[PDB]
Amino acid sequence: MSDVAETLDPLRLPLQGERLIEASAGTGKTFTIAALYLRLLLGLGGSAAFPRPLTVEELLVVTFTEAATAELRGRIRSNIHELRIACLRETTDNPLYERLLEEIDDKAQAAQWLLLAERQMDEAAVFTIHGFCQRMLNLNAFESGMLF
Amino acid sequence: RGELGFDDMLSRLDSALRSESGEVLAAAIRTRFPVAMIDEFQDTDPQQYRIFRRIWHHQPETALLLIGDPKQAIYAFRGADIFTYMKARSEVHAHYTLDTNWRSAPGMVNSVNKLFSQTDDAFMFREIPFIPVKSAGKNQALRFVFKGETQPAMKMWLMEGESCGVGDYQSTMAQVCAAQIRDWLQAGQRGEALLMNGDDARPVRASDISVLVRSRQEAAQVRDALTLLEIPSVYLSNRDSVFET
Amino acid sequence: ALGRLLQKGEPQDAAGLRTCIEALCDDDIAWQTAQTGDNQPWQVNDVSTAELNAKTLQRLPGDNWRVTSYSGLQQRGHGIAQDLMPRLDVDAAGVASVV
Amino acid sequence: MLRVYHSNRLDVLEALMEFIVERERLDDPFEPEMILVQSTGMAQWLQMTLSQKFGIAANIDFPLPASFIWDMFVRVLPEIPKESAFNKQSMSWKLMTLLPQLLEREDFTLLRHYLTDDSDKRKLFQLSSKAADLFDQYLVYRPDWLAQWETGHLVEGLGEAQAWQAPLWKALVEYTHQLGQPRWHRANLYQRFIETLESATTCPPGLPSRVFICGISALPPVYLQALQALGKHIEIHLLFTNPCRYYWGDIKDPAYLAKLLTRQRRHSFEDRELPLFRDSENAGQLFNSDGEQDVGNPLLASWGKLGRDYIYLLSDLESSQELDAFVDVTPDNLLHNIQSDILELENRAVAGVNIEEFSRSDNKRPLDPLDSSITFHVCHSPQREVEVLHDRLLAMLEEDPTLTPRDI
Amino acid sequence: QWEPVLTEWITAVLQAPLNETGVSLSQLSARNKQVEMEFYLPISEPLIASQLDTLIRQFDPLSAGCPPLEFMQVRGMLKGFIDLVFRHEGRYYLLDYKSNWLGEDSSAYTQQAMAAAMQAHRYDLQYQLYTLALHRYLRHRIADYDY
Amino acid sequence: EQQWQAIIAEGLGAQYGDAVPLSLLRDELAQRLDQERISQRFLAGPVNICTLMPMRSIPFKVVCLLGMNDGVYPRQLAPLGFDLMSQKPKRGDRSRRDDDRYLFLEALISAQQKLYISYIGRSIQDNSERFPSVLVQELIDYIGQSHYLPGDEALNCDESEARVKAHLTCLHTRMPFDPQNYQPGERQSYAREWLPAASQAGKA
Ligand SMILES: [Ca+2]
């Protein structure tokens, strides 16, 4: 907070409204996004968790490149697929997923929420600023004044 | 004509969140997407930011993660506004930073930190403060050797004389740069230029050199001095079309 | 930019530069003077053994199965005609004049 | 009777149909053989296949469900116009003459200013169309909402816009009366159809003798009801191609479960049905009171959503007479395995849940480095991607003869 | 302004005597017509333009105007539309409406000229094909039918 | 003329009073002309190339799917959003997503001999990496997890699974004249035309 930002610990970052994360050059912006994504899907965290567990069609992620969303989307269908397997096995011997596992309270359930999310990916709310825009526009065409 | 450009897309979305009929809309959205992660945020602009706070700002039951880096906002010419990033920075109070720099050598990390640590407000906009970073352990062993011992992570090549015009500092610099490249490149065929991680080593190939440049012209100036040493090159940012070939 | 970090802001002599560089400078940061050079080579060779060939197929054309329709007759022009309108009065064709 | 044939492959279904046609001679006075079909391809495949195992195909009508259901309406009920007056397109024009008036009603405020700020009828006509479109849909899924809005009533539990659609529809209906056109829709006419058919237990008025429904994997609930009612005077062979021989759908009450634990006959022999006695209905099968928690195969599991629904709707019928015709699929190819896994409603995936499972790998199926059914291909661009296929087709044509290219 | 000429044209053509004996389209109720029938004839054993020429010649005085065999070998299927097939109490027919050419007047629609055009467009081929179709179709529909 | 006629007729039917501007008609014609699909050769002069159509599942010895890319295959389009039916769904309801995902199944199910699957692996410019259609991911993920290559009989779930995936995925070359297509084995090209180039057998 306040003066000179706090060294963001992904796993304990409060997923409740307005957070500015500065990711210097070569710092893991991508690994972090991912983690956060998983945290939100499984409503993990603690007092730093989000009120409820969200769905793939509810996690809005906007990127700038067409290539960015693609990559991002590709990267996330993977962490899901993995955090999920490491949830059936209840064991992971690779960083992120272990700490996450520690945070989970019913591996059996995660694995089903995750499996759904994996299946949904062809619709993850991962868009470009423009994509996000023509979508919000087109849906609420009456407010926007858009043509269909 | 019945059309839409890109600027219009997010423009009409701004005017929509500002029309009177703007609450039904903000709420609509807020419900579909309770939490949103905006990446590369340093590159937004008034229109976007406004779209984003109007929908997510001070709104319980939602979360707005804005991730990016003001030190890398280089899209001025397109429309990207470093100031609307600085404002947003004023309005949100929770700040965070990633402290470690996976990806690079410790000397590299050290000399960059050193360089940008000199004066205060290196990026000369107090709102864009520069905080150093630590290098990762998995990379403590990286080091580059050339014809003998470890070369330093950052080397300044410095022309002589008192004056110096833009034209000279180019002819001369491109020259120097191509030279140091074959010097690397052929010392690499012989095994004396090694990219090493502790006790592992591989020779430097052409696929490891890279020349950053500011424009189509500079690039040529380089390609030329390089071509003059028989060293084949590619300008990855080339925009020409196949139609004027 | 680079000039501003090196000369900490204040403008310098052409020699005041040299001295600022030297100032921040050990193993990690180092400088040398623009040592020009020449030696047209990038003394690298090649070697190559193009041991190639292409699969040739030993099956043959033979027979063709098709769906025809009294088009075995009516020469083309009807290309895409019978396609766009399956029931066009294909038997007609032409213009009409001073009649 | 409304007979329903389930099968692993269109061939067998075509076959049965091929049969039914040879058996009851069918009359002969220029009466069309009839086949619901929902794509020209199917109609193409059918005419060809049929001209082969008969030497010629000549009448066959290939109506789209919607089109047929309404043809019978005109046959079974008294005085019904050919072509309803609420067909999607004309409704579009009518709505364009109404909406302008209807505006400024607080009811339609939203459409009110959407329609102002500029136009030359562009927005007006687009709205009149998307609206015409929804109505067209509601008239098939949600028919009751219309009888309801027509009178001035709302339906509890809908989003807004019901706010303008209900009024709007009512407007269209009256208006279409003032123009003097046949009040008759599809929603105000289906119940009546079922009734006058479900009763009038005497005989078939003037409809066709038999009717086929080929290669269609979904029909709207009402459409099925009307089909059933219809199949109590008419012979209706609905050929559904199913990817599994067991029931892989969802279930309602614990009471409906055993009402499905029925049995389908072979079109030609004894009887069959889902495996494992009870355990099955128990186990997980119908866990979440909702779906079949397991659905054996994880592929059928995620892709078949459209099919589970239709599967579920067919087995909720009564006048129905479902029967099996599934052919088997011996597991010799990678392709063949997978198809079998799906036909059997089995899962062969190994997650490796315990070191036991996870360590050996010989529990999976042995591949065969020489197997090329199911192959993957990554390329740099459409062009390349197509060149690459032109080769592979050549190779596979080369490999086994018998492969003529209509087969690809 | 074409209505006068056309309505007067339609009836004429309705009330004409196709086969003298009763005939006249106007005597055909719905139940006795089938419009635009569509047939598919499988044709195995390539159909060589030559081999079809020989017999077409033998049996048809028209196709005696021999330029034929203008196509090339084809195994496969044979699509086709029949403008109208109607029946006249025992007896099925093949009708083909042919709007055709602007050959000035009357002088061009007489039993020869027609027979002429018939060969120009080798329509004779159409008959034979079409009836082989109607033949097969009737044989398949009418249990115990004779050509 | 047909489309144009049908359009106007349909208006006349509904007895449209007011006058209509050309744009209204020109636009409808345009749309109508863009939905009209030509597929009259769908099964004669062989090798059918087309899109995946709903309600047209026919058995074929060979079945190949191209450009099955993320963002390209399960084809999309969000309901109007003022579509009451879409928010409160029911068993009969249809959607492109379901139709489209069900077509990918019907494909698997109808191929009698070989299923060919293809996608684009990376744009030939920014050289950034592509991604396949989640539907294709699911297909090789379930293969891998239920098969193992004769060699690898005692190694690992994850280990054997990768090899099977790597064995069935066949990365192809950027240019048709890259030598790898003319070595021996898995799809050497039948296109001699590029042989010389491949073998640097040219004359400057
Ligand atoms: Ca004709």
CA of A102: how far to CAs of A131, B109, D358, in Å?
Answer: 36, 33, 22
Note whether D45 and D52 are within 8 A (CB). Answer: no
Tokens standing for residue F13? 């039917």
Coil/strand/helix, residue D90: helix
Residue E28's nearest CA partner among E41, E16, E36 is E16
Q: Ligand 1 center to residue E131 CA distance, Å?
A: 14
CA-based angle B76:B82:B87, to the nearest 5? Answer: 150
* Distance separating alpha carbons of residues E16 and D358, to the nearest angstrom: 86
Residue D140's nearest CA partner among D181, D97, D102, D84 is D84
* Distance separating alpha carbons of residues D36 and D293, to the nearest angstrom: 34
The DSSP symbol for F112 reads E
Nearest to B107 among C18, C28, C41 (CB): C28
CA-based nearest residue in chain D for residue E145? D28
User: Inter-chain contact B36–A29, Cβ cutoff 8 Å?
Assistant: no
Note whether E65 and C56 are within 8 A (CB). Answer: no
Single-letter code of the amino acid located at D25? R
Tell me the Ramachandran region of residue F37: left when phi exceeds 0, alpha when psi lies from -120 to 50, beta otherwise.
beta
Q: Which residues of B touch C5 (CB under 8 A)?
A: 115-116, 118-119, 122
Burial group, residue E108, by CB count within 10 angstroms (0-12, 13-18, 19+): middle
Mutation target among A22, A76, A147 for the B interface, most CBs of B within 10 A: A22
* Distance separating alpha carbons of residues D370 and D375, to the nearest angstrom: 11
Residue F159's nearest CA partner among D159, E65, D198, D350 is D350
Quickly count: other Cβ atoms within 10 Å of residue B199's Cβ: 6
Ligand-binding annotation for A144, yes or no, is no
Quickly count: other Cβ atoms within 10 Å of residue B8's Cβ: 15
Note whether E137 and D60 are within 8 A (CB). Answer: no
* Distance separating alpha carbons of residues B178 and B160, to the nearest angstrom: 18
Put simply, whether F186 touches A (Cβ < 8 Å) is no
Specify the residue for token string 């330029």. Answer: E67
- The residues of E annotated with a catalytic role in the active site are 96
Q: State the smallest CA–CA distance between residue F204 and chain C in angstroms.
A: 17
Q: Which helix (H) or strand (E) holds D236?
A: strand D235-241
Burial group, residue B237, by CB count within 10 angstroms (0-12, 13-18, 19+): exposed
CA-based angle F43:F46:F52, to the nearest 5? Answer: 60
Tokens standing for residue A118? 């994996």
The DSSP symbol for B152 reads P
Note whether A136 and A70 are within 8 A (CB). Answer: no
Long-range contacts: E121-125, Cβ < 8 Å, 24+?
E121/C74, E121/C91, E122/C73, E122/E63, E122/E67, E122/E68, E122/E70, E123/E98, E124/E56, E124/E60, E124/E62, E124/E63, E125/C70, E125/C73, E125/E56, E125/E63, E125/E68
* Distance separating alpha carbons of residues D34 and D65, to the nearest angstrom: 11
Cβ neighbours of residue E34 under 8 Å, at least 6 residues apart?
D30, D59, E84, E85, E86
Q: Ligand 1 center to residue C92 CA distance, Å?
A: 10
User: Inter-chain contact D406–C59, Cβ cutoff 8 Å?
Assistant: no
Backbone angles phi, psi at B196, to 5 degrees: -125, 145
Note whether D295 and D345 are within 8 A (CB). Answer: yes
CA-based nearest residue in chain D for residue C64? D404
Q: State the smallest CA–CA distance between residue D128 and chain F in angstroms.
A: 12
* Distance separating alpha carbons of residues B200 and B188, to the nearest angstrom: 15
Chains B, C: CB contacts within 8 A come to 96
β-bridge mates for residue E39, sequence order: E80
Taking chain C, what is the end-to-end CA distance rounded to the nearest angstrom? 86
* Distance separating alpha carbons of residues C71 and D199, to the nearest angstrom: 53
Note whether D186 and D86 are within 8 A (CB). Answer: yes
Single-letter code of the amino acid located at B70? P
User: Inter-chain contact A17–B19, Cβ cutoff 8 Å?
Assistant: no
Put simply, whether C60 touches F (Cβ < 8 Å) is no
Any contact of E with B, at least 3 CB pairs below 8 A?
Answer: no
Specify the residue for token string 């010389």. Answer: F196
Any contact of A with E, at least 3 CB pairs below 8 A?
Answer: no
Put simply, whether C69 touches E (Cβ < 8 Å) is yes
Mutation target among C20, C44, C47 for the B interface, most CBs of B within 10 A: C44
Experimental technique? X-ray
Q: Which helix (H) or strand (E) holds B175?
A: helix B168-189
Note whether D325 and D16 are within 8 A (CB). Answer: yes
Cβ neighbours of residue D269 under 8 Å, at least 6 residues apart?
none
CA-based nearest residue in chain A for residue D110? A142
Note whether E120 and E113 are within 8 A (CB). Answer: no
* Distance separating alpha carbons of residues F105 and F102, to the nearest angstrom: 5
Residue A20's nearest CA partner among B72, B65, B69 is B65
Note whether A36 and A10 are within 8 A (CB). Answer: yes
| Chain C residues with a Cβ under 8 Å from any Cβ in chain D | 55, 57-59, 65, 67
Note whether C53 and F182 are within 8 A (CB). Answer: yes
